[PDB]
Design a protein around this nucleic acid. Structure first.
Lengths: 192, 86, 118, 122, 132, 108, 101
RNA sequence: CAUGAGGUGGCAAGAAAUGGGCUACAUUUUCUACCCCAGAAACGAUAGCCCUUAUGAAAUAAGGGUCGAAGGUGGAUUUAG
């Protein structure tokens, strides 16, 4: 063997240079005598050089606060900033009415096929749509099962088509054709 | 009433389910065509590992000598003694 | 007025390039191709070259055995499809005397086979 | 450092909420401190929340052949940490979510990221 | 008596490590897990083939690293990086170690269709936690 | 042809360098396609030939209307709604299933 | 090269049911709709009765992924009781604890 | 040439006895509304038979109809807290 780099290294060295990647422990690389385990009755926690449990630990050594700081000095390029849309929820609702739900479910393995990850659902405000009176009456009568009374939120779900973008298309299509059929006056409305 | 039934029909036509009034004994059919069957399930047809690639690849790689399987070594020695005396 | 900015677009590579710029080279650590065990440490350039040729040897070891037995690796689980993880076929699948067979053998670089069926 | 300012205005993610869910509270809150420090020097308001853990418990027989009265009970400790996020850009979402899912931990991790992109009606 | 994963006491001369010294009721009170895959967490679908791949890899590693793996393996699985961490002894020749490292590397790469990384740790002798 | 692809191979060999870092290991894994496309959308690839939201659920153009007052047409409405509610089958399997019904009904 | 002839018979059931899966769905919908005349369903009754009796998913038994054991299998890993006990007690499977509460 | 392998069809019925559960033999009960301030009675099969439904290639389960058993708080002994 060789006298290891654990005592070859000295102070004032760059741990982002030492550990770039998420890696298992490697106690020879680690300059820290980490002791793991339930000790024996007249003994110490067992040593550093051969610890299966220290290799089993998720090992957040590669992410130290100076590594976050320098790394995001590198990442500070990849960002713009927000406009003055304000922290106010009514302000951002006025600026941008509709709210669409489209998420992802990240697994870990060979395949990235989580089908439920295509679920999409749209919430819109009638007080921000602003253009429905007997159209809003007809609208509620169309979608009875949604639109709870306490908050003026319309929630339309789609899980009918495999792709997330055409699920978004289904959502916006239902919004516009519910709107158009609500504004389409029918001949049997008066005999209510 | 009749207005409620035709609002249900209009909502059905607008959303994509069955428009005309139809009972549960064909809503079973529309749900059957709405789902995959229990035989097309990925877990159903990939429940078992096929075991041929596994067992035959290990047979080949041991006989290559890049794999050492102690179970097969044990039966090899045992069957050598069996052909020796039996 | 909303000053909504236009989204700057990248590849899958520039973030990791900025990561390399974050991790410049370690003046106390060896090249990362070798392992980090002191026993597995090559002491000389000849030992490092021997270890590297052993690694390349083992790489084409499994290349030979996998191209010899492609039936045991046809089951793809990874999505999307990875042709460079898919094993390569070196035997001519076109058996009749044809120009398609000539092109197949030319692509497979079988010189005597191509000459013989020409 | 390639940038490529291309063409079209932002997709405007409000409330990207990250549900980080595992077997290990120390992994969860170390990842919490990591992500909170990261978003702190990024300049984005990150908030913390602790949804209550769920334990999936079930029972198996202990002996091979007989003795139903003596059973081994096993359990799964499934522990939620909600890291809800508001007021962050689409490109910033790409870069922050990029680094978060790259330094995601091992089998003690899942992360369900809920994006609320706003947009305009049509 | 419970005979699940408890090595018995013979008379005091039996070298034994932390792993197989500790009993299954200390499974994460003291021990932890040897394989970290997110399949067994409450919402996931593929945990069954995760487990059959786990047992395949453990038996494959025991059979292709003959008589050098000290105790059992660390099988981690993050994203599509499968990581095989080994605790292998220092008794064979390092060209042979690197040969089998590359061999296992790309065999598991073409079998599991993912980046598989062998991370080795060499130890002089089988570590002893207590004597039973 | 052969000379330009062989020149590409030779250029790759003479600009092929040792890995020297784990981030560069991830770099070459991204370049080859070993590592996942990142960030994930749970939908790497999986185009379904640009079906785009009407082929999946609006099946009149493949319905090919019979006398619509018929029980055959009502059954076709039921099957069309079921195939619309299918997210797992694609439009190709949906239509092939539809003309299987058309073929069998023409046989009877 | 299998666990046993029963598990080979079962994987034959799995494969050949998976490939004779579509037409069984089609005319089983033609069973359990009430739209068609009874004799026009009867002709279908004879053709499903003539469809082979090893592709009907009523013969599908969820045996263990590791060793053939019919009853005593947990579906989430396709593992039998004591093989799951084996793996979870050596701790080669994450997240499972001993349930003390 | 078998004690191995495959296909098709049957095997799981009580002159009887016994272990363990479930429901009861009602008035602190039963039916109804309510989910505990009322009204009315003044009992008990999750068994048998019929119809329909669920699932299934091919019924076991569910609901309804029908019926209105034995049963009058159980000896010696014994269980659990």
């Amino acid at each position: 063997a060789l006298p290891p780099r654990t005592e070859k290294m000295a102070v004032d060295q760059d741990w982002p240079s030492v550990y770039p990647v998420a890696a298992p422990f490697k106690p020879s690389a680690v300059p820290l005598p980490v002791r793991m385990g339930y000790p024996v009755k007249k003994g110490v926690p067992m040593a550093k050089e051969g610890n299966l449990e220290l290799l089993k630990i998720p090992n957040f050594l590669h992410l130290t606060p100076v590594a976050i700081k320098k790394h995001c000095e590198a990442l500070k390029d990849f960002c713009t900033e927000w406009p003055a849309a304000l922290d106010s929820d009514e302000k951002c609702e006025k600026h941008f009415p509709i709210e669409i739900d489209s998420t992802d479910y990240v697994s870990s393995g060979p395949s990235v096929r989580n089908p439920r990850a295509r679920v999409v659902v749209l919430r819109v405000k009638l007080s921000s749509l602003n253009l429905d009176d007997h159209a809003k009456k007809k609208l509620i009568k169309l979608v009875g099962e949604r639109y709870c009374k306490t908050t003026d939120v319309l929630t339309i779900k789609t899980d009918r088509c495999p792709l997330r973008r055409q699920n978004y298309d289904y959502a916006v299509y239902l919004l516009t054709v519910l709107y158009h059929e609500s504004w389409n006056t029918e001949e049997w409305e008066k005999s209510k | 009433s009749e207005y409620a039934f035709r609002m249900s029909r209009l909502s059905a036509r607008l959303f994509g389910e069955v428009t005309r009034p139809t009972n549960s004994k064909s809503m079973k059919v529309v749900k059957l065509f709405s789902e995959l069957p229990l035989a097309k399930k990925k877990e159903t047809y990939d429940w078992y590992p096929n075991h041929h690639t596994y067992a035959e690849l290990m047979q080949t790689l041991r006989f290559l000598g890049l794999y050492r399987d102690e179970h097969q070594d044990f039966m090899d020695e045992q069957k050598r003694l069996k052909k020796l005396r039996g | 007025e909303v000053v909504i900015p236009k989204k700057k677009t990248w590849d899958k590579v520039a973030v990791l390039q900025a990561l390399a710029s974050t991790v410049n080279r370690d003046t106390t650590a060896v090249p990362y191709v070798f392992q980090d065990d002191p026993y597995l440490m090559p002491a000389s350039s000849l030992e490092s070259r021997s270890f590297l040729l052993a690694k390349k040897s083992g790489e084409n070891v499994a290349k030979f055995i996998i191209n010899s037995y492609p039936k045991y690796f046809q089951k793809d689980i990874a999505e999307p499809h990875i042709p460079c993880l898919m094993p390569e076929y070196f035997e001519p699948q076109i058996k009749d005397i044809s120009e398609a067979a000539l092109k197949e053998r030319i692509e497979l670089r079988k010189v005597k086979a191509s000459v013989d069926m020409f | 450092p390639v940038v490529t300012i291309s063409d079209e205005p932002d997709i405007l993610y409000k409330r990207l909420s990250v549900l980080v869910k595992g077997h290990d509270k120390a992994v969860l809150d170390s990842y919490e401190y990591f992500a909170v420090l990261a978003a702190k020097e990024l300049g984005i308001s990150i908030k913390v929340h602790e949804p209550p853990r769920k334990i999936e418990r079930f029972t198996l027989l202990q002996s091979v052949h007989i003795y139903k009265k003596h059973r081994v009970q096993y359990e799964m400790r499934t522990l939620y940490r909600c890291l809800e996020l508001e007021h962050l850009t689409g490109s910033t979402a790409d870069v922050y979510l990029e680094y978060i899912q790259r330094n995601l931990p091992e089998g003690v991790a899942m992360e369900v990221t809920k994006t609320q992109l706003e947009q305009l009606p049509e | 008596k419970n005979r699940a994963a408890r090595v018995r006491v013979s008379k005091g001369d039996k070298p034994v490590t932390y792993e197989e010294a500790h009993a299954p009721h200390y499974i994460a009170h003291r021990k932890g897990w040897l394989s970290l895959h997110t399949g067994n967490l409450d919402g996931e679908d593929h945990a069954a083939e995760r487990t059959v791949e786990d047992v395949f890899l453990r038996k494959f590693m025991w059979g292709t690293f003959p008589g050098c793996l000290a105790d059992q393996l660390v099988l981690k699985r993050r994203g599509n990086q499968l990581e095989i961490c080994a605790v292998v002894l220092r008794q064979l020749s390092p060209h042979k170690y690197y040969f089998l490292v590359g061999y296992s590397e790309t065999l598991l790469s073409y079998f599991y269709k993912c980046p598989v990384r062998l991370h080795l740790q060499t130890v002089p002798s089988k570590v002893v936690y207590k004597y039973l | 042809s052969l000379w330009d692809v062989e020149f590409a191979k030779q250029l790759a060999t003479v600009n092929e360098q040792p890995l020297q870092n784990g981030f560069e290991e991830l770099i070459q894994w991204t370049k080859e396609g070993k590592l996942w496309e990142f960030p994930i959308n749970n939908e790497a690839g999986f185009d379904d030939d640009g079906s785009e939201f009407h082929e999946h659920i609006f099946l009149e153009k493949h319905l090919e209307s019979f006398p619509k007052q018929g029980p055959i047409r009502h059954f076709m409405e039921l099957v069309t709604c079921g195939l619309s509610k299918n997210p797992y089958l694609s439009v190709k399997q949906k239509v092939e299933h539809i003309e299987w019904f058309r073929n069998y009904f023409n046989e009877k | 090269h299998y666990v046993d002839w029963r598990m080979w018979r079962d994987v034959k059931r799995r494969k050949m049911a998976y490939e004779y899966a579509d037409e069984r769905l089609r005319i089983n919908s033609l069973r359990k709709n009430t739209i068609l005349p009874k004799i026009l369903q009867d002709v279908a009754d004879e053709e499903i009765a003539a469809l082979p009796r090893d592709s009907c998913p009523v013969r599908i038994r969820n045996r263990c992924v590791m060793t053939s054991r019919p009853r005593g299998v947990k579906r989430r890993w396709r593992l039998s009781r004591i093989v799951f006990r084996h793996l979870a007690d050596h701790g080669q499977l994450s997240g499972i604890q001993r349930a003390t509460w």
